[PDB]
């Protein structure tokens, strides 16, 4: 029977930057959710609502698999109700999480010698993100009183910041891939169970 | 509470150097943008530069560039501004004033003045009773003062009783006096029916020499 | 650089009336983003660091009288006091920030017209804390007068004095309009004691006949 492609969610060449963070839908099929939770791959694997111990049992209306690249320091934002540059400008998780929230470390394939660039973070957004937001713009910060014009200098800066990401970096600068698993039910028949 | 404190007045050598602060409060110091305003006396308001104590970046008017320079402590909370050679254009009271998203001026600290004189020893001023007299004869009401007399550099203040007393005081603006240094008088009116009763009591402050002198009206 | 045109340099009204200033600009003041005017409005009473009336050209701020409301766009802005009150005087600059650098007006005084009213006349002869030191400061008080137009002369047995009196005056009252002079006579111990009257003449357009408050060099 149909199984639901997580190795595309989890074993991708590129993840994307975790201000335009990445977001499949899976429906309808089987998936089971204890490859997953066996693996130790991840050193994060922390659930919110439901429970990883027997998981592949229940049946759910929609299942979102978001994945990006975050830092090391800052997997620990990818929890409900979390603040900082990541959960208020770049990706938030509700009061109410019902999911999982997997990641590993990247520094094999995402660090660069010379720091790599391409992962990127927002700075600056004006108010906060609501959950399971998504702001994709690169329009100037107003940072007070006076306008930009589409020109960065004093309090008028560019909103995103690079990961610069770097192999022998410690720990806290080294790139974390990060899968959310946001199962959620419905008032419409389901479509992902497991065995 | 947003509270922005500037300094004491200030007495500089000319072409010589000064620093003047700004403690911030209440408030988170890296969000909100600090800018100086210049106003020297008789004139207008003028606008002398930006900081921004996050990322620490600087604009400046085009006629102060050079000869001030903005520069923020991020653990005290404090703007700081430096005039590096002070002429006697320099002769001003800046303003330190923070701001907000919808206008560039939002709260204003307290004013620093900015005296620029040639080693003109800072001279604690004497004060004399403006002793009363009476608008008619049967009372009616009744004058009494102070008199400040010989004093440098301009920045006086003067109460009546603690700050008690409040009420028609009337206290003028300071005037150059052929000396060299300056005088000023506050003045009050009260209803003669007090004068026995009451005291009434004036008190002077000097900043620019440490001159609190407390005296009464014979 | 973005230079305000205000008009007019002073002006004065009595209470009740309309005052209606204005404020102009090198370039148009319109983002085209967000179509707003980045221009201020800041009331600055004397003595006071300056306080913001209206922002983006046409908004009271929280707790400013609906009797303030400002106007315009891109080049003529105004402000217009519905009906002065006495507390309105203070002097009044536009100040724009659509560009770097921030430019303010040259600003609009308020001046209050009241109604005519009569000075009151006190002498102070100096204390002698101050004459055993060596000089002699005679003081000259016109207390709650307008208008501010007031000669004033000494005289030391009807003999004029000149070159040396000061006069200094008040800002207009904010509660009810009027002034207030110091005119000070300056003379020393070897001048002072050389006389017995001394007095003060007080012209005023509310004072019909002249008057002079006076005392004698004693004790
Ligand atoms: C800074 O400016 C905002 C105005 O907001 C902006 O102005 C418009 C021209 C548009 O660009 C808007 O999209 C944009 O938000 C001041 O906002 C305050 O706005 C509300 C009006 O909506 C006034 O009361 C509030 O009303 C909402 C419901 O609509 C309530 O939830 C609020 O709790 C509050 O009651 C409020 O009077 C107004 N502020 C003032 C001072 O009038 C914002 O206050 C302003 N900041 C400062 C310091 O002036
Ligand atoms: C993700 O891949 C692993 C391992 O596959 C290897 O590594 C990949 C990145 C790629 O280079 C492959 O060609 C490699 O062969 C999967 O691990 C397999 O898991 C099953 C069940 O757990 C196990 O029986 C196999 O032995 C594993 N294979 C290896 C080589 O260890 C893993 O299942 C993939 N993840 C998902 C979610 O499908």
Known sequence: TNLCPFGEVFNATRFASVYAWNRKRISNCVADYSVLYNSASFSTFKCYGVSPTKLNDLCFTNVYADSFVIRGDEVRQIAPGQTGKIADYNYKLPDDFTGCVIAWNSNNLDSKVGGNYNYLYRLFRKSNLKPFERDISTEIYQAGSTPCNGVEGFNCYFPLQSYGFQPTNGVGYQPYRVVVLSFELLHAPATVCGP | ?218 | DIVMSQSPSSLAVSVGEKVTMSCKSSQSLLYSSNQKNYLAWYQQKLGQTPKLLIYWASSRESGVPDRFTGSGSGTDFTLTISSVRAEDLAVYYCQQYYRYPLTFGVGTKLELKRTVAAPSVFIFPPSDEQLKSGTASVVCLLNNFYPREAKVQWKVDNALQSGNSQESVTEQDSKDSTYSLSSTLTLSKADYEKHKVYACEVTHQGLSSPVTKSFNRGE
């Open chain 2, 1 to 218: 509470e947003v509270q922005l404190q500037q300094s004491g007045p200030e007495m500089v050598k000319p072409g010589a150097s000064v620093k003047i602060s700004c403690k911030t409060s209440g408030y988170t110091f890296t969000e909100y943008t600090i800018y100086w305003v210049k106003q020297s006396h008789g004139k207008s308001l003028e606008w002398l530069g930006g900081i921004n104590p996050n990322i620490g970046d600087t604009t400046y008017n085009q006629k102060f560039k050079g000869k001030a320079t903005l520069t923020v402590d991020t653990s005290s909370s404090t703007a700081y501004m430096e005039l590096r050679s002070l002429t006697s254009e320099d002769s001003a009271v800046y303003y330190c004033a923070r701001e907000v998203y919808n206008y560039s001026f939002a709260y204003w600290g307290q004013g620093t003045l900015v005296t620029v004189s040639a080693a003109s020893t800072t001279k604690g001023p004497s004060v004399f009773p403006l002793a009363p007299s009476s608008k008619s004869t049967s009372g009616g009401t009744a004058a009494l003062g102070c008199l400040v007399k010989d004093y440098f550099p301009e920045p006086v203040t003067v109460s009546w009783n603690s700050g008690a007393l409040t009420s028609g005081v009337h206290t003028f603006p300071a005037v150059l006096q052929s000396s060299g240094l300056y005088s000023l008088s506050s003045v009050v009116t009260v209803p003669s029916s007090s004068l026995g009763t009451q005291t009434y009591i004036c008190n002077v402050n000097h900043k620019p020499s440490n001159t609190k002198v407390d005296k009464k009206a014979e």
